[PDB]
């Protein structure tokens, strides 16, 4: 298992990709996945050693380019929209 | 002038309770939000 590192994964045949993390929320012993309002498979109960993981999207977010006109300068700044400053 | 001050002030007060006990006063703004969310959900589910 690997936590806090974007991974593909498979659990009992459930296949998805995210950032696996420990979570507090408690299940009912026969329940397996989690979900959310949007039917987005979210929590997962760790099949070997029972614990409530999570999932999370990877990052995504767009790239944007903040420039004074090229007529002025070729110096640009780049806005990575909605990511904590780590990946880059 | 004095009477009018009160008629003003009281009228101010009522507005609060015209709100604090009634959420449906905001119906307009309340809908604009819903219809937005109501899209995305309907949009998201289309993935399934």
């Amino acid at each position: 298992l690997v936590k806090n590192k974007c991974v593909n994964f498979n659990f009992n045949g459930l296949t998805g990709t995210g950032v696996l993390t420990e979570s507090n929320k408690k299940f009912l012993p026969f329940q397996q996945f989690g979900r959310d309002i949007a039917d987005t498979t979210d929590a997962v109960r760790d099949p070997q050693t029972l614990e409530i993981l999570d999932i999370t999207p990877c990052s995504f977010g767009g790239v944007s380019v903040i420039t004074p006109g090229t007529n002025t300068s070729n110096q640009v700044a780049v806005l990575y929209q909605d990511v904590n400053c780590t990946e880059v | 002038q004095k009477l009018i001050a009160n008629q003003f002030n009281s009228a101010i007060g009522k507005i609060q309770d015209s709100l604090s006990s009634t959420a449906s006063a905001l119906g307009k703004l309340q809908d604009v939000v819903n219809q937005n969310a109501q899209a995305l959900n309907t949009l998201v589910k289309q993935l399934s």
């Binding site: 929209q81 | 959420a23 006063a25 905001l26 703004l29 309340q30 939000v33 949009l43 993935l47």
Partner: peptide, 20 residues
């Protein structure tokens, strides 16, 4: 403010509820 409740984003409004 009480009375109100895959690449999908929410871009923050330029202005913000301090400025507004």
């Amino acid at each position: 403010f009480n009375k109100v409740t895959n690449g999908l984003t929410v871009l923050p409004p330029l202005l913000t509820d301090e400025m507004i």
